[model samples]
Target: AECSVDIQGNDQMQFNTNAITVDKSCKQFTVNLSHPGNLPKNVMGHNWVLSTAADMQGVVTDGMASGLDKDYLKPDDSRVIAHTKLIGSGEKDSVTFDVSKLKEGEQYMFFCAAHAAMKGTLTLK
Candidate 1:
């Protein structure tokens, strides 16, 4: 596996893709995001956050209060599968998480913390 991925967040309230996947044979995974837009963090910043789809809502709710310093995420939220930092224009961030954490048949997702419409699913291999 390549072990690293590049995703894009745009000027709109959207990510270029909604879905992602994990290969069972891999022990680790990484995602790097690029914000090609010129907007600042306060306008249309984006970050890739991974977690169970079920938890995405509450996570975003709490994250909103956590502010930009916390990457728009709740401080040390255990339910977060993984996440990248809140980024502005021409910025990027990456995350590596243990593949062992995934449970067979369970659903996982990557979505924007600031926007619910930006979401997708990845079934385990």
Candidate 2:
């Protein structure tokens, strides 16, 4: 069974899709992120970050303070479940995590640390 998904980010500060589902039978899950635009990392960088819906905002807020040097995320933030490195145009990255980290019925979210609008919902089924 497929246990990985590819997501794209673009110059418009948007993700190609807004929702993702994890197969319950998979022991691990992977998210592959790519940026197709030509913008530099400083201007339009993107990274995939995952956490519970309730932790999203807090992660983003602290990430902003952490700056690009830290991939816009706090140093070893416990709230983050998984994430990829900040990438610019034509760059790609991926993150794989234990499926057990996710709980059924719990609301989860995925987003780019640099742009909160580039966000989506994640579910386990």
Candidate 3:
């Protein structure tokens, strides 16, 4: 991928970093999410979901209802800009989306539905 970011999710519902930047010049961007803790998907599963501030709750609510098979995300969800599948320890997933999808003034976030505390922000430049 042209624009790529890597993040780590631990069992404590925490990410290694709180912020990531998306390059406006890139056509698309990808987030490589990983779980460093030693836990199963059911117990400590983590995912990277990106959406606007307004769409965050709805998407998360619908995604939680969607179940783990869909990686805690709704199928064909318009609110989701990009997302990775639920992953276990030593597992990883990536989500990619068009840079154009991000508006200049819009703010976005990356979160783990598995836990609320595991959230991060990304501002386009």
Candidate 4:
């Protein structure tokens, strides 16, 4: 609850920040996601999903079958650390999770289910 960050998504299917840092002092971290694009949710919807680098592909593959109504993510996916709801132009969502869910030296990745190209990594410090 002591840490927070803002990430922006655009029509180009990209995230403004490609990396993130979770300070060790925070027990919880929050990510505020905003879509600055002009596309509609069905056309260029975006959501923030966090998981181990190894688990990302599988999650995304399964998520595609889950459909947009489910935010393009598999329901109750244990591999996901946290995620934001699907959003479109001028829309925003946020997710807060416990820092303990992350481990040092492990590779963590965040990406958009609708667009695999839109991704980033998280570093614990």
Candidate 5:
């Protein structure tokens, strides 16, 4: 089964899609993201971060203070399922995590640490 997804994050603080899925047969899942905008990392970068929908807020809150060096993510934050590095124009990043970490019916999501509007849902079925 297909176990990976590619998404785009543009300067408008948007993700290309809002939903993703993982079939039960996969042992791992990957998220790939690219930036097609002209902005730089500090001003309008993008990253893919995963967590339970409930944990998204706290993660973003803490990440905001962590700064760019940390890819806008809290260091060693256990709540994160997986994440890609923050990227600027023409750059890309990806992350793969064990599918076993996800449970069926749970509300899982991927978001951009730099922008709240850049977010998506991931479901395992």
Candidate 6:
């Protein structure tokens, strides 16, 4: 669907899509994440985390402390608008959130809380 995106992560610690634009007409948005590599979650985990661009760093920092058990994200973090659970090879996950939470022209970001290189920018258009 136009309101959703399917993202893939590999063993190389990279995400297939580095940029995404959310349509303003959609009331809700969805992100689907998949790990196509063979590594385990501890070695090459991936998750889709969404928040404002300004909150990216803080969310990632706190996520590191939250550990893999918590999907590498702070529990009940207000900054996180939406997130999927961490997944290993062949595993898949998805998250959906209200589009109203996003503002037009606002800078948004998505990333794997477990890996710095697996990140992307999101925009409400």
Candidate 6: which pairs clash? none
Off by over 4 Å in 1: 65-69
Query: What are the lDDT figures for the candidates, one per model?
Result: 0.80, 0.92, 0.84, 0.90, 0.89, 0.88
lDDT of 4: 0.90
Give candidate 4's error at residue 108 in angstroms. Answer: 0.3
User: Top TM-score: which candidate number?
Assistant: 2
> Once model 2 is optimally superposed onto the true structure by TM-score, how far is the C-alpha of residue 43 displaced, in angstroms?
1.8
Using lDDT as the measure, what is the rank order of every candidate, best first? Answer: 2, 4, 5, 6, 3, 1
lDDT of 3 by residue, 1-125 (tens): 24888899987778999899987788888889899979978888888888887888888889789877777778899888887888889999888888988998998888887775678788887
lDDT assessment of candidate 6: 0.88
**Can you write out model 1's per-residue Cα lDDT over 65-113, one digit (the tens) per residue?**
8966776789889879888877788998888888887787788888888
List where candidate 2 sits over 4 angstroms from the true fold.
none
lDDT of 5 by residue, 65-123 (tens): 89777877999999998988889989998889999889887999889887876888898
- Clashing residue pair totals per candidate (backbone < 3 A): 1, 0, 0, 0, 0, 0
> Least lDDT summed over 10 consecutive residues: which range in candidate 4?
1-10
- Candidate 3: residue 15 Cα off by (Å): 1.1
* Candidate 5 regions with alpha-carbon error over 4 angstroms: none
Of models 2 and 4, which has the larger TM-score?
A: 2
RMSD after CA superposition, every candidate: 1.7, 1.0, 2.0, 1.6, 1.3, 1.3
Question: What's model 5's TM-score?
Answer: 0.93
Q: Can you write out model 2's per-residue Cα lDDT over 5-124, one digit (the tens) per residue?
A: 999999999999999999999899999999997998888998999999999999999989998778789999999999998889999998999999999989999999888888999999
Candidate that beats the other on lDDT, 2 or 3, i.e. the better one? 2
The number of the candidate with the highest lDDT is 2
RMSD of 5: 1.3
Candidate 3 stretches greater than 4 Å from native? none
